[PDB]
Amino acid sequence: STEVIAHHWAFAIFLIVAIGLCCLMLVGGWFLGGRARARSKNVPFESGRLSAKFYLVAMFFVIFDVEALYLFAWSTSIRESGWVGFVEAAIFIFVLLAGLVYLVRIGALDWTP
């Protein structure tokens, strides 16, 4: 149809013009304005080892994001799945919340010592 390909063209123009807009913003910022040198200019501004809890938080985000994708697939087809799929998703969320409670109680989600 004509409408769908016009929508595709409009979306392509949107993405291309946005990317070109930020690219031209960079081009204008870099090209314009005078430049001058200082001795400590190139030194990073520092007002004149990382813990494993960051990895644990990102890991929990990954795992619960995969279970979130499962619930994403469930949520768009809730009525056709019926009460049986509701029971399956209740078991799924029960396992999810049991794992979450287990993570909470052993201090995995506790940032402070």
Binding site: S51, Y55, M59, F60, F61, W74, S81
Partner: protein, 162 residues
Amino acid sequence: MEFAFYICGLIAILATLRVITHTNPVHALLYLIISLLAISGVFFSLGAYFAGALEIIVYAGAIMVLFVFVVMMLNLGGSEIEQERQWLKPQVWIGPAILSAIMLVVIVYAILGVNDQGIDGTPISAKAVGITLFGPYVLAVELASMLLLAGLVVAFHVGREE
């Protein structure tokens, strides 16, 4: 539809080639993210809209975030990595490359000798995927939840600091 598929496949192939031949871990992960975006474009070209949405949501939005997180915490400055470049040394890489090459020709021989009526590109929505997921594939869902739970427990037990 086919033009986007071929362009995205070429971008994914070149990006993956750049990942497997790089010394900077962050550059390699960025090229891997670019290849995941290209494979998502391939998925969107084939009508698997949910698969591409999950590639950018989960694969290019969670797992590579975890890899980037780990590379940040390691503070990889290329100690005995950029100073070695042993993968770029030819007599190391000639062997495995020709191994993957002959494996690729065998798999290509397998692929070219099958019936192909073409992919019509009919969009498969996430509603049908969800109906199938909670229909004929219910034990897969619950035991995949148990698999994610197992990975959770394993990597919590391993990756503690104390």
